[PDB]
Swiss-Prot record, chain B:
It comes from Homo sapiens. Transmembrane segments: none annotated. This is Large ribosomal subunit protein mL45. Component of the mitochondrial large ribosomal subunit (mt-LSU). Within the mitochondrial ribosomes, required to direct the nascent polypeptide toward the tunnel exit and position the exit at a distance from the membrane surface. The chain holds residues 71 to 295 of 306 of the full protein. It is found in: Mitochondrion.
Curated annotation (Swiss-Prot), chain C:
It is linked to Combined oxidative phosphorylation deficiency 59: An autosomal recessive mitochondrial disease presenting with multisystem manifestations of variable severity. The disease spectrum ranges from lethal infantile Leigh syndrome to a milder disorder characterized by hypertrophic cardiomyopathy, lactic acidosis, attention deficit-hyperactivity disorder, and survival into adulthood. The modification N6-acetyllysine is found at residue 93. This is Large ribosomal subunit protein mL39. InterPro entries: Beta-grasp_dom_sf (IPR012675), Pro-tRNA_synthetase (IPR050062), TGS (IPR004095), TGS-like (IPR012676), Thr/Ala-tRNA-synth_IIc_edit (IPR018163). Component of the mitochondrial large ribosomal subunit (mt-LSU). Mature mammalian 55S mitochondrial ribosomes consist of a small (28S) and a large (39S) subunit. The 28S small subunit contains a 12S ribosomal RNA (12S mt-rRNA) and 30 different proteins. The 39S large subunit contains a 16S rRNA (16S mt-rRNA), a copy of mitochondrial valine transfer RNA (mt-tRNA(Val)), which plays an integral structural role, and 52 different proteins. Gene3D superfamilies: 3.10.20.30, Threonyl-trna Synthetase, Chain A, domain 2. Keywords: Acetylation, Leigh syndrome, Mitochondrion, Primary mitochondrial disease, Ribonucleoprotein, Ribosomal protein.
UniProtKB/Swiss-Prot annotation, chain D:
The keyword Signal does not apply. It is found in: Mitochondrion. GO terms for cellular component: mitochondrial inner membrane; mitochondrial large ribosomal subunit; mitochondrion. Belongs to the bacterial ribosomal protein bL17 family. Coiled coil: none annotated. PANTHER family: LARGE RIBOSOMAL SUBUNIT PROTEIN BL17M (PTHR14413:SF16), RIBOSOMAL PROTEIN L17 (PTHR14413). Keywords: Mitochondrion, Ribonucleoprotein, Ribosomal protein, Transit peptide. It holds the Pfam family Ribosomal_L17. Component of the mitochondrial large ribosomal subunit (mt-LSU). Mature mammalian 55S mitochondrial ribosomes consist of a small (28S) and a large (39S) subunit. The 28S small subunit contains a 12S ribosomal RNA (12S mt-rRNA) and 30 different proteins. The 39S large subunit contains a 16S rRNA (16S mt-rRNA), a copy of mitochondrial valine transfer RNA (mt-tRNA(Val)), which plays an integral structural role, and 52 different proteins. Signal peptide: none annotated. This is Large ribosomal subunit protein bL17m. The gene is MRPL17. GO terms for biological process: mitochondrial translation. It comes from the Eukaryota.
From Swiss-Prot, chain E:
This is Large ribosomal subunit protein bL32m. One of its GO terms (cellular component) is mitochondrial large ribosomal subunit. Residues 86-108 are annotated as: Disordered. GO terms for molecular function: RNA binding; structural constituent of ribosome. One of its GO terms (biological process) is translation. The gene is MRPL32. The chain holds residues 79 to 186 of 188 of the full protein. Residues 91-103 have a biased composition (Basic and acidic residues). MRPL32 precursor is processed by the m-AAA protease (composed of AFG3L2 and SPG7), which cleaves the N-terminal transit peptide. Cleavage by the m-AAA protease takes place prior to assembly into the large subunit, an essential step for mitochondrial ribosome (mitoribosome) assembly. Proper processing by the m-AAA protease is dependent on the zinc-binding region within the tightly folded C-terminal domain of MRPL32: zinc-dependent folding halts degradation initiated from the N-terminus and triggers the release of mature MRPL32.
């Protein structure tokens, strides 16, 4: 196996000069060997991606999936170690930077088909990974305006070179 | 029921604590106190006849300065040689993932050996001697975060300090040394410097059947 | 005579100097203890920084729901702004728009909306003409509109605004709402207030009235961006707590002599209590009717 | 096509649907507040109010007695529909039951409902309460109402 | 009928990450005024509902202790009295169920 996500919450950074930006806090948490499919954890983790911690906890509190309950427990644990061990001031000043799911170690079990046949079943296990970053949830990327589409077109009508000449 | 047992090189407590006197910092029975001391000092010199209690305080100051400087570079090997196993975890555990920047500016007044007590022989064949030393120095401190942000103290500013540091040497051991065991903080001590962040103390998380009774 | 730009940066400079003076008055970090005695999250202790931390800081310690639904604070029983620094160990209770008795929140919202209208009025008229603001009266929220009394130029004593000009006022107010400016607060000495509003006689008179009412002659100045005004109470945290805003009518008051005090009226509703188009239109008409104090 | 089909295809058939709703009604008459899946509670709610109407018809009405005998399996509740519940609602015309949505069931994530016969002796449900009359919008609309009462 | 060719991860990502397959974000979430826990604006609050249900379950336990057996519903009405409360003149001929706690503030 590989367990590198839990060693990330142990990087000590050099002390900061008094004229630099404050450097937001990063908190890495994860739960391993969850009796769930990674392909359903994906939808839960893509839903809570980029959200505030409180907004994420609301959506997970009212979602209907077993994975939503597990990810709520993991998010609450991560918030607790954020303001317990990584010196985050306000427990609401956090957002979900990264939220993904990985395959776990699974088990193979026979599934008796008819005739004399068999299928091999997978007892699926997954991982859930979360990085919390101190700060307000970052402003979403606004949609492209007609002015931005036109400026891109005219840049390209003006970037054209005479091809295959001197 | 093995014949091998753990060879402890320290104890877990303080032998007959020096209750710090009220007014020791505010102002800039004695025969029995200094009697228990002399009796014990002779016990230490029974175990090593080249000890001078007039020579200890400068050694204690050197051990203090060099131990706390190990906390700056994280030299845990030197720390295990200048501090006891009882003092190692409550000096390193809370700094493990933090940057500690400590300095020793000066000493306001010389250090005094203020209490010497010794344990009995029946501690597994080992006899320990514990000496209390008062210190009043001027130190700086700046504890940084995992991300390099300030949590505690100021970088350059020196602040006064009064500590009753208790050193211990295991006398029966052939290569024993005088190391820092604990330090007494008085019950009348001045309050410490405020931290640099706001803290929320949570109230009682109540089960639904429970009622908030103030 | 200072040009209106120079008056603006002068007033901003004095405001910043006084605020930095109080922040220098308290230099060393000091820790106060604020007890949360609200119904939800009961008995919760916040350990705050004195004259730095805010009821918003306690709200951020609680949750984002408190941050976004808390409009006022009840600090030791008295209504406190959410962005006003806390000066002592106290008890806090956050106040929303949808409580059992939202009266203080309603008064703070009506005062804040009047302030924004006053900023729009001050920076709406052209450079030639003269604009002075007298006061924003305390008009009950059951009356239909918030009001600001403005003395305009004698070149424009015959002038009444058209519907296009009133909608231009409304568009400037919505530009303020989009700008989302915190409503900054400063308790200040009457001397420093008089200094800031030196070139304005109505502001002198109102400052003197409030300074007479309070024993140490401390008055309340609020700032939304570059506009500073004297207030008769706490305000809401941000201009973005307005959703529906309109400058409805301009009414000329009875005694035209010695001067014409014109009552600019408006009506607003927050995001938390926004109304449908039919209901908002009826509130618009009832705000277009004149309000008497 | 199921236009104008006012009933639910519940259970193992029509008799099974009636028996499920009968057991729900017997539980509601015994305990005066039950919780069940939301659709079952709606379908049963209608029967719960017609049962109170037959109880108000009374114990000497042989049709009402026969109907209570069918719909109440435990037979101690028939004295209770006629001498307790039916009297409680002698003043009301037809609003006897309250149905509200309660979270979601933590086994199969079913939409759940609580139903109670009004009156009761149990602790009150946390009912949805409208906004106060002292909020900003309501005070503005009351100013509007007072000015209309003046002008007309 | 069997797949004639394997489906690629690009085709599969388009099918599985189409916006129809994604979880929609909810906007009917509001803070319960009485306890502060999160509620859906059309569904009873969970914390308050289980508070009510646990008190109701204790009152139902004491009801069965008094009834004592099956098929013994009363033909009179019922009333719940807590510690320090006498029966009212209106609560006269009513089966009184006694509970050994203070009356909860939300119960009137
Ligand atoms: Mg076979
Ligand atoms: Mg079925
Ligand atoms: Zn609740």
């Amino acid at each position: 196996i590989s367990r590198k996500w839990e060693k990330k919450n142990k990087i000590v950074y050099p002390p900061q000069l008094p004229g630099e930006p404050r450097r937001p806090a990063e908190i890495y948490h994860c739960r391993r060997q969850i009796k769930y499919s990674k392909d359903k954890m994906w939808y839960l983790a893509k839903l809570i991606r980029g959200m505030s911690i409180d907004q994420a906890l609301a959506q997970l509190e009212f979602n209907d999936k077993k994975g939503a309950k597990i990810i709520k427990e993991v998010l609450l644990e991560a918030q607790d170690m954020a303001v317990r061990d990584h010196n985050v001031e306000f427990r609401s000043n956090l957002y979900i930077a990264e939220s993904t799911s990985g395959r776990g170690q699974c088990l193979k079990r026979i599934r008796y088909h008819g005739r004399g046949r068999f299928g091999i079943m997978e007892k699926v296990y997954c991982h859930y990974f979360v990085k919390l970053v101190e700060g307000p949830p970052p402003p979403p990327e606004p949609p492209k305006t007609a002015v931005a589409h036109a400026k891109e077109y005219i840049q390209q009508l003006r970037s054209r070179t005479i091809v295959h000449t001197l | 029921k093995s014949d091998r047992s753990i060879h402890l090189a320290c104890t877990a407590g303080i032998f007959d604590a020096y209750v710090p006197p009220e007014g020791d910092a505010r102002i800039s029975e004695r025969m029995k106190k200094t009697m228990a001391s002399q009796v014990s000092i002779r016990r230490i010199k029974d175990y090593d006849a080249n000890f001078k209690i007039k020579d200890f305080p400068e050694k204690a100051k050197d051990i203090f300065i060099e131990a706390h400087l190990c906390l700056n570079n994280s030299d845990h090997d030197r720390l295990h040689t200048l501090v006891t196993e009882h003092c190692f975890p409550d000096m390193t555990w809370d700094i493990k993932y933090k940057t500690v920047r400590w300095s020793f500016v000066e000493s306001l007044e010389p250090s005094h050996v203020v209490q010497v007590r010794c344990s009995s022989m029946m501690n597994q064949g080992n006899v320990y001697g514990q000496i209390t030393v008062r210190m009043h120095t001027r130190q700086t401190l700046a504890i940084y975060d995992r991300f390099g942000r300030l949590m505690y103290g100021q970088e350059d500013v020196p602040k006064d300090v009064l500590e009753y540091v208790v050193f211990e040497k295991q006398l029966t051991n052939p290569y024993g040394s005088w190391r820092m065991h604990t330090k007494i903080v008085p019950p009348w001590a001045p309050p410490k410097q405020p931290i640099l962040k706001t803290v929320m103390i949570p109230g009682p998380q109540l089960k639904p059947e429970e009622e908030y009774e103030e | 005579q200072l040009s209106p730009t120079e008056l603006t940066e002068m007033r901003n400079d004095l405001f910043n100097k006084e605020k930095a003076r109080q922040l220098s008055l308290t230099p060393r970090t000091e820790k106060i203890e604020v007890k949360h005695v609200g119904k939800t999250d009961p008995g919760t202790v916040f350990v705050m920084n004195k004259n730095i931390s805010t009821p918003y800081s306690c709200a951020m310690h609680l949750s984002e729901w408190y941050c976004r639904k808390s409009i006022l604070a009840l600090v030791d029983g008295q209504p406190w702004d959410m962005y006003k620094p806390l000066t002592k160990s106290c008890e806090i209770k956050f106040l929303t728009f949808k409580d059992c008795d939202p009266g203080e929140v309603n008064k703070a919202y009506w005062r804040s909306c009047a302030m924004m209208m006053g900023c729009v009025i001050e920076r709406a008229f052209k450079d030639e003409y003269m604009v002075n603001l007298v006061r924003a009266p305390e008009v009950p929220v059951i009356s239909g509109a918030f009001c600001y009394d403005v003395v305009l130029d004698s070149k424009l004593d015959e002038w009444m605004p058209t519907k296009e000009n009133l909608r231009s006022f409304t568009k400037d107010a919505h530009a303020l709402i989009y700008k989302d400016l915190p409503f900054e607060t400063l308790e200040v000495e009457a001397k420093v207030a008089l200094e800031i509003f030196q070139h304005s006689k109505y502001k002198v008179d109102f400052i003197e009235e409030k300074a007479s009412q309070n024993p140490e002659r401390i008055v309340k100045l609020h700032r939304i961006g570059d506009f500073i005004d004297v207030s008769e109470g706490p305000l809401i945290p941000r201009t973005s707590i307005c959703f529906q805003y309109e400058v409805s009518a301009v009414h000329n008051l009875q005694p035209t002599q010695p001067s014409l005090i014109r009552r600019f009226q408006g009506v607003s509703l927050p995001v938390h209590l926004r109304a449908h188009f039919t209901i908002w239109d009826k509130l618009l008409e009832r705000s277009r009717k004149m309000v008497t104090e | 096509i199921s236009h104008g089909r006012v009933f639910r295809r519940m259970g193992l058939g029509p008799e099974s649907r009636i028996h499920l709703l009968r057991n729900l009604l017997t539980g509601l008459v015994r305990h005066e507040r039950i919780e069940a899946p939301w659709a079952r509670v709606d379908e049963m709610r209608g029967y719960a109010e017609k049962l109170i109407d037959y109880g108000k018809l009374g114990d000497t009405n042989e049709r009402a007695m026969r109907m209570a005998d069918f719909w109440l399996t435990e037979k101690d509740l028939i004295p209770k529909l006629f001498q307790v519940l039916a009297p409680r609602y002698k003043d009301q015309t037809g609003g006897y039951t309250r149905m509200l949505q309660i979270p979601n069931r933590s086994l199969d994530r079913a939409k759940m409902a609580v139903i109670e016969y009004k009156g009761n002796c149990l602790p009150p449900l946390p009912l949805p309460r409208r906004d106060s009359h002292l909020t900003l919008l309501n005070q503005l609309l009351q100013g509007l109402r007072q000015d209309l009462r003046q002008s007309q | 009928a069997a797949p004639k060719n394997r489906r690629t991860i690009e085709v599969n990502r388009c099918r599985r990450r189409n916006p129809q397959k994604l979880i929609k974000v909810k906007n009917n979430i509001d803070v319960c005024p009485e306890c502060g826990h999160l509620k859906q604006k059309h569904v009873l609050c969970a914390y308050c509902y289980e508070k009510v249900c646990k008190e109701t379950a204790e009152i139902r336990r004491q009801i069965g202790k008094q009834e004592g057996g099956p098929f013994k519903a009363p033909t009179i009405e019922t009333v719940v009295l807590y510690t320090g409360e006498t029966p009212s003149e209106q609560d006269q001929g009513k089966r009184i169920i006694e509970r050994d706690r203070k009356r909860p503030s939300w119960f009137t």
